[PDB]
Amino acid sequence: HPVAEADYFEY
Amino acid sequence: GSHSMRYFYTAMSRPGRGEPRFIAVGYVDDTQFVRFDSDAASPRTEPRAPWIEQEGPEYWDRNTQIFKTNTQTYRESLRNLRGYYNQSEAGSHIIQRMYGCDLGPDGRLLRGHDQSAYDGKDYIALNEDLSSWTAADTAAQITQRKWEAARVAEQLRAYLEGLCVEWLRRYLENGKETLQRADPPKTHVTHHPVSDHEATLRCWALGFYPAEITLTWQRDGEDQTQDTELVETRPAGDRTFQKWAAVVVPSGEEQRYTCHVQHEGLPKPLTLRWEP
Amino acid sequence: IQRTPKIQVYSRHPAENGKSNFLNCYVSGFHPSDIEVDLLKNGERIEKVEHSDLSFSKDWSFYLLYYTEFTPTEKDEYACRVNHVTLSQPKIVKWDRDM
Numbered sequence: 001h002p003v004a005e006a007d008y009f010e011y
Numbered sequence: 012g013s014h015s016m017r018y019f020y021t022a023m024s025r026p027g028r029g030e031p032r033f034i035a036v037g038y039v040d041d042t043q044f045v046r047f048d049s050d051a052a053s054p055r056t057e058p059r060a061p062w063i064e065q066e067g068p069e070y071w072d073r074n075t076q077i078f079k080t081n082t083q084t085y086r087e088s089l090r091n092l093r094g095y096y097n098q099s100e101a102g103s104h105i106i107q108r109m110y111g112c113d114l115g116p117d118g119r120l121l122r123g124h125d126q127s128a129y130d131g132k133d134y135i136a137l138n139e140d141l142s143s144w145t146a147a148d149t150a151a152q153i154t155q156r157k158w159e160a161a162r163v164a165e166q167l168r169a170y171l172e173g174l175c176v177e178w179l180r181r182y183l184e185n186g187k188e189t190l191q192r193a194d195p196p197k198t199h200v201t202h203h204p205v206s207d208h209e210a211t212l213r214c215w216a217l218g219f220y221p222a223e224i225t226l227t228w229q230r231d232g233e234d235q236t237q238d239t240e241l242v243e244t245r246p247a248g249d250r251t252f253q254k255w256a257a258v259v260v261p262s263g264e265e266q267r268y269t270c271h272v273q274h275e276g277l278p279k280p281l282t283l284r285w286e287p
Numbered sequence: 288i289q290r291t292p293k294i295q296v297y298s299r300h301p302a303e304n305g306k307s308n309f310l311n312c313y314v315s316g317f318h319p320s321d322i323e324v325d326l327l328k329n330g331e332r333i334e335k336v337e338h339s340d341l342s343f344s345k346d347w348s349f350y351l352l353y354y355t356e357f358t359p360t361e362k363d364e365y366a367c368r369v370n371h372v373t374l375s376q377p378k379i380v381k382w383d384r385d386m
Binding site for chain 2: 001002003004005006007008009010011
């Protein structure tokens with residue numbers, strides 16, 4: 001199962 | 012044995028040809044088990060191994076939501092990286108990310124990983140401490156600052172030590188007849204004259220899983236690293252892998268050469284020779 | 288910035304004439320990811336060729352397996368034809384059952 005990211009995970 | 016899970020993301024811009032493609036694939040060891048492709052007619056997470064099919068709709072929906080969200084986020088990230096490198100809007104660029112967890116033979120967490128690249132060059136990586144970052148350049152330092160500000164590392168650590176290991180263990184149990192089965196290489200040595208006084212000895216390994224294998228030639232018990240042609244381990248298409256190692260030897264000297272095979276599937280390492 | 292593909296052409300099972308098998312072309316070690324791969328039978332493009340999902344190695348280079356069912360014979364020639372941004376023209380690698 002993959003990790004859930006957020007919008008602040010943006011580079 | 013030891014086992015790992017990895018997700019591999021590729022986000023690729025293509026100016027003039029629509030928005031950046033996002034594709035994610037998931038692996039346990041050398042077995043792919045899911046894919047998501049934003050260019051698919053109807054993008055959704057799809058199973059790619061029989062043992063994942065038993066997961067319920069909630070699983071597929073969750074995965075698809077995550078990947079759809081990433082499809083958007085990674086497009087913004089591509090825009091951001093373009094700016095960090097003062098690049099023109101004309102060129103295609105690629106963010107790649109690989110992450111996941113490694114288990115030791117006891118099923119315990121060995122270590123976690125989260126690494127990113129931009130246009131094929133290392134960009135930023137989570138350190139083994141799962142707490143700090145290594146940034147490759149002053150652009151990646153901008154990402155690092157952003158990720159430090161947003162405590163991204165803490166969230167990756169939670170995943171890597173938690174969900175990652177938990178799911179990997181589940182997959183290993185569900186797919187135990189394959190994922191926890193090492194198939195040893197089937198081996199033979201072939202002989203092909205290359206001239207009157209040289210011949211090729213090719214040591215073959217076929218039908219093995221997982222892909223990790225060591226295939227070497229020795230002459231009089233000495234490794235022949237420089238004189239050995241070694242092809243990249245290659246997938247057969249039936250889950251197994253193939254590899255060969257070849258040496259060109261003086262005619263008549265064939266019996267001085269031994270092929271040595273190490274594979275998880277082998278309790279005992281093989282020593283093979285040409286058998287005329 | 289760019290890495291040219293490695294190419295291997297080979298069969299899934301040991302080749303036996305008149306026995307159905309799979310013809311593989313494995314392209315690997317390339318960057319960026321766009322790549323064109325055709326399997327050829329006596330020089331002509333085979334139509335129904337499938338491929339694996341895009342993934343990459345630890346060094347970030349991409350790899351793909353292209354494959355199709357085939358029945359090798361003594362006289363039919365097979366090959367894999369690859370183009371990539373790094374190649375000025377398509378590269379053809381012939382199927383050699385000893386490779």
